[PDB]
């Protein structure tokens, strides 16, 4: 081993240790909103169906408790 190789390696290390990094927060901030609406939009179909069929409001809830001929 010599000093030339070691110095060249040290210089190349510092050279590589200079890559810039741009922002990456707005991407996730927008992806979260693009998914929230896509997930909570389809409920309007069920709401309109329940309001136009015959049953009144209030009884319309969320979860997984089966269904019947009165509550949705």
């Amino acid at each position: 081993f010599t000093l030339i190789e070691l110095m060249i390696v040290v210089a190349i290390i510092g050279i590589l240790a200079a890559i810039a990094i741009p922002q990456y927060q707005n991407y996730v901030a927008r992806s979260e909103g693009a998914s929230a609406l896509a997930t909570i939009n389809p409920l309007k179909t069920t709401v309109e169906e329940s309001l136009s069929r015959g049953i009144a409001g209030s009884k319309i809830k969320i979860g997984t408790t089966a269904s019947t001929a009165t509550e949705t």
């Binding site: 019947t68 001929a69 009165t70 509550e71």
Partner: protein
């Protein structure tokens, strides 16, 4: 003899068509009879001849 069903306002199964809930049976027997009354009056007359 006769039978009648019982049903309250829409209930059971959360339906809305008035379902049956009970029943009430009625029995009995008819009877007929006739009667004829008759009352005759008579006057008594006693004496003691000698």
């Amino acid at each position: 003899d006769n039978s009648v069903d019982v049903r309250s306002y829409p209930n059971w199964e959360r339906a809305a068509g008035t379902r049956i809930t009970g029943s009430v049976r009625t029995r009995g027997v008819v009877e007929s009879r006739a009667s004829v009354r008759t009352a005759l009056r008579f006057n008594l007359e006693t004496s003691l001849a000698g």
